[PDB]
Write a protein that binds this ligand. Structure first.
Ligand SMILES: *[C@@H]1O[C@H](CO)[C@@H](O[C@@H]2O[C@H](CO)[C@@H](O)[C@H](O)[C@H]2NC(C)=O)[C@H](O)[C@H]1NC(C)=O
Ligand SMILES: *[C@@H]1O[C@H](CO[C@@H]2O[C@@H](C)[C@@H](O)[C@@H](O)[C@@H]2O)[C@@H](O)[C@H](O)[C@H]1NC(C)=O
Ligand SMILES: *[C@@H]1O[C@H](CO)[C@@H](O)[C@H](O)[C@H]1NC(C)=O
Ligand SMILES: *[C@@H]1O[C@H](CO)[C@@H](O)[C@H](O)[C@H]1NC(C)=O
Lengths: 596, 185
């Protein structure tokens, strides 16, 4: 009797126990997020610790069926996921030391505070306090203390920790046969498959970089336009051929330029479409929104929400004694138990969010028949891409007409479209160079290409060169500014934010084709195209059972990441910016400094 | 006169692996899914049979598909098989309100492993450790050795296909013995 026999029957029994322990973890965690009590924190910890103990134990057992000896690729993909390994291969001392470090970092990020150099008793956490300054201030000096203070106080603490964290992760990664921690992380896009659905870890670098050069033009003109307006925002602070002072960019990092919008609004007298007041006047409540989001998905031929989804979801802030976490999320607890937790308000924003989050649930329902270990998006980027596609079509004036949040005789205003596409680019394309540059730095640090003595030096060389952003004050190697961002300090790969953005518009372009949409790529509304929803579902239901390259091909026709749809989405704005910049510089110096 | 209540409205059903059989003999019978294979249910109150066997267990919504002739699955292969020429009805209904509970109810089991498939209407209640590999278990679970039974785990929040369903499988028997089960005629 063959080793694939043993593997199949081992997995058959694991699936039952795993499904059960994992369901108890989901339930206890859900109990916390919808009722924060110290008792519930306890039940959440106790159950989550049971699940991870079970998993690591079973992950060792899964290793006794060598992958070489398995032929059926559905069993093979199951085992690869279970026997995927890390951190156990270290010594027990270094494994314990690593966790001490990851834990030190993660908590000094959520508790370190920085004090205003002029009001010493005003000491502000990031989480409510500095964040409010970096997202709402228009004062150069106020924004500067906050930005610099958080990077001198919280950042410098993390520097020796991050230093040692790099050493241990690389030891772990090479102990598992990867080149470095980065090569380990790029394994999340790897695929081992015949006839050209393979995808090598080094190709992710190849594809990320090649897509990025195509972005540079659109980013250059977005950059030139905001630099112009920001010059007006903060007169005599910004060079017109220079880079952007990092502390003026709209959040704590310049991760999203989206809060810069009211300083640079293209057509000030065409206020952006806001169906909030319509919703309030038609007496819509939270139930109505979600019903409407359900309607949208049926119209493309996807299922209704399960009856459990309506009993067990938490669609409003409970308003009794209970204390909750309001951040919208879409849970797949297991055992076809699907729920959304969201503190819904009657706003146009929460209307779109319900669509975005119900899209997550549709993905979850679609692959529920796959084996347990394969119930995920095709890779780390697919779930959010699918969610965002829904938010896109539901915001269009056409859909808003058909559901009567916009009068039937309403006519779209091309200037109002430019307003909307600018705000979109401030978020969507703004973040792409930020994201690519961060992971490139991280990836290089792990490879050993950047020495310790040049960490912050190459960081800002890359901020200046790639992102067109320049540090307002000089930072030596006493700083660890990349760790002053959550995902770095909390040890999370960052490239998903880049790939899922590119995936999202690949999906939407492919679906609007199928829906025989007429004009430009924004303004598209896949509503009522059962053909489009069905193509979507044919991939959604794959789970992780096929390589993501095949999964992408199932919807768009190529097995490749491709950024041309993103550029196509923004083509209207792209030509508008070009004409707006007839008398602006485009690109940046990389020599100019506020402090020079 | 027929005791269909104590098989349908029974408080505790059996585990599918140890499925229950009740012989119905010498009475009158007055008759969610309800699927018949050898006979028209609409004509049931008119017919007459020597014996009527009432088989009952619980099962997942997923698995109600398997209590039918010519089916394959853990349930049909390893717990309750119906013969290709089955002549009878499979009545099923959702029992979430009854057989699931907030902590999980785990008193319902099905056999997960067996060295061969059951013959039709065979029952197997052995609990011998299942040796999947060359090296023998010694009553000891693990190392390619498994406890043959597996628990269900019904909670009220599960999706429908994971919820408990109560099943009754009525077989109808025509021997040359005097028929003793009927309705009006
Ligand atoms: C999705 O659900 C709705 C209702 O929850 C279904 O619409 C019908 O709604 C009326 C009253 O609202 C009910 O009496 C009907 O039983 C519902 N069902 C049907 C089939 O009309 C809607 O049809 C559901 N969509 C799908 C694809 O099942
Ligand atoms: C896919 O594979 C192509 C063939 O290369 C050979 O096969 C693969 C599976 C490797 O094991 C390699 O060592 C072999 O030489 C590659 O040429 C091609 O670039 C690959 N494509 C991607 C996206 O990885
Ligand atoms: C919330 O938590 C408390 C104790 O942790 C518990 O008594 C209560 O039933 C829980 N649920 C709700 C809905 O309040
Ligand atoms: C018991 O069985 C009969 C079957 O016809 C049904 O009508 C009845 O409602 C069942 N339940 C009770 C509580 O009587």
């Amino acid at each position: 009797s063959t080793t694939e026999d043993l593997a199949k029957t081992f997995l058959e029994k694991f699936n039952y126990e795993a499904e059960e322990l994992s369901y108890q973890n989901s339930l206890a965690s859900w109990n916390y997020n919808t009722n924060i009590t110290d008792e519930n924190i306890q039940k959440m910890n106790i159950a989550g610790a049971k699940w991870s103990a079970f998993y690591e134990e079973e992950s060792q057992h899964a290793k006794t069926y060598p992958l070489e000896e398995i032929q059926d690729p559905i069993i093979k993909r199951q085992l690869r996921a279970l026997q995927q390994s890390g951190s156990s291969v270290l010594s027990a001392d270094k494994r314990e030391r690593l966790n001490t470090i990851l834990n030190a970092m993660s908590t000094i990020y959520s508790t370190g505070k920085a004090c205003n150099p002029n009001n010493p008793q005003e000491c502000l956490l990031l989480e409510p306090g500095l964040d409010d300054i970096m997202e709402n201030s228009k004062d150069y000096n106020e924004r500067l203390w906050a930005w610099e203070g958080w990077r001198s106080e919280v950042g410098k603490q993390l520097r020796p920790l991050y230093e040692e964290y790099v050493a241990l992760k690389n030891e772990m990664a090479r102990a598992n046969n990867y080149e470095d921690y980065g090569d380990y992380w790029r394994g999340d896009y790897e695929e081992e498959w015949a006839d050209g659905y393979n995808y090598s870890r080094n190709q992710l670098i190849e594809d990320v970089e090649h897509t990025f050069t195509q972005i540079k033009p659109l980013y250059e003109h977005l950059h030139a336009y905001v630099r112009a307006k920001l010059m007006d925002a903060y007169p005599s602070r910004i060079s017109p051929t220079g880079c952007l002072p990092a502390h003026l960019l709209g959040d704590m990092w310049g991760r999203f330029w989206t809060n810069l919008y009211p300083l640079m609004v293209p057509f000030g007298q065409k206020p952006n479409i806001d169906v909030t007041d319509a919703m309030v006047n038609q007496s819509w409540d939270a139930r109505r929104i979600f019903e409407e989001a359900e309607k949208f998905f049926v119209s493309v031929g996807l299922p209704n929400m399960t009856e459990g989804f309506w009993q067990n979801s938490m669609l409003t802030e409970p308003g009794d004694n209970r204390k909750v976490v309001c951040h919208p999320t879409a849970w797949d607890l297991g055992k076809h138990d699907f729920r959304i937790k969201m503190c819904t308000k009657v706003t146009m924003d929460d209307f779109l969010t319900a669509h975005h989050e119900m899209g997550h649930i549709q993905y979850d329902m679609a692959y529920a028949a796959q084996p347990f270990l394969l119930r995920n998006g095709a890779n780390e980027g697919f779930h959010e891409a699918v969610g965002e596609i829904m938010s896109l079509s539901a915001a269009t004036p056409n859909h808003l007409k058909n559901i009567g949040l916009l009068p039937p005789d309403f006519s779209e205003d091309s200037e109002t479209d430019i307003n909307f596409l600018l705000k979109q680019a401030l978020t969507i394309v703004g973040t792409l160079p930020f994201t690519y540059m961060l992971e490139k730095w991280r990836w290089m640090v792990f490879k050993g290409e950047i020495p310790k003595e040049q960490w912050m030096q190459k960081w800002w060389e890359m901020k200046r060169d790639i992102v067109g952003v320049v540090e307002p004050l000089p930072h030596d190697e006493t700083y660890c500014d990349p760790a002053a961002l959550f995902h770095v300090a909390n040890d999370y790969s960052f490239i998903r934010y880049y790939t899922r953005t590119i995936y999202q518009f690949q999906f939407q372009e492919a679906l609007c084709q199928i829906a025989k949409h007429e004009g430009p790529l924004y303004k598209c509304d896949i509503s009522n195209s059962r053909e489009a929803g069905q193509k979507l579902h044919e991939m959604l239901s794959l789970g992780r059972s096929k390589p993501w390259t095949f999964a992408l091909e199932r919807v768009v026709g190529a097995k490749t990441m491709d950024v041309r749809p993103l550029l196509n989405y923004f083509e209207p704005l792209f030509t508008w910016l070009k004409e707006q910049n007839r008398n602006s510089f485009v690109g940046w110096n990389t020599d100019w400094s506020p402090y020079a | 006169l027929c005791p269909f209540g104590e098989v349908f409205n029974a408080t505790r059903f059996a585990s599918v692996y140890a499925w229950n059989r009740k012989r119905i003999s010498n009475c009158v019978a007055d008759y969610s899914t309800f699927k018949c294979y050898g006979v028209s249910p609409t004509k049931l109150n008119d017919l007459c049979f020597t014996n009527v066997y009432a088989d009952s267990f619980v099962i997942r919504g997923d698995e109600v598909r398997q209590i039918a002739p010519g089916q394959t699955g853990k349930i049909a292969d390893y717990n309750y098989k119906l013969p290709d020429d089955f002549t009878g009805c499979v009545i099923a209904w959702n029992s979430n309100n009854l057989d699931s509970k907030v902590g999980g109810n785990y008193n319902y089991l099905f056999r997960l492993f067996r060295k061969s498939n059951l013959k039709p209407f065979e029952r197997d209640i052995s609990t011998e450790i299942y040796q999947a590999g060359s090296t023998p278990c010694n009553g000891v679970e693990g190392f390619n050795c498994y406890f043959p039974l597996q628990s269900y785990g019904f909670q009220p929040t599960n999706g429908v296909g994971y919820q408990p369903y109560r099943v009754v499988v009525l077989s109808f028997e025509l021997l040359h013995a005097p028929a003793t089960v009927c309705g009006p005629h």
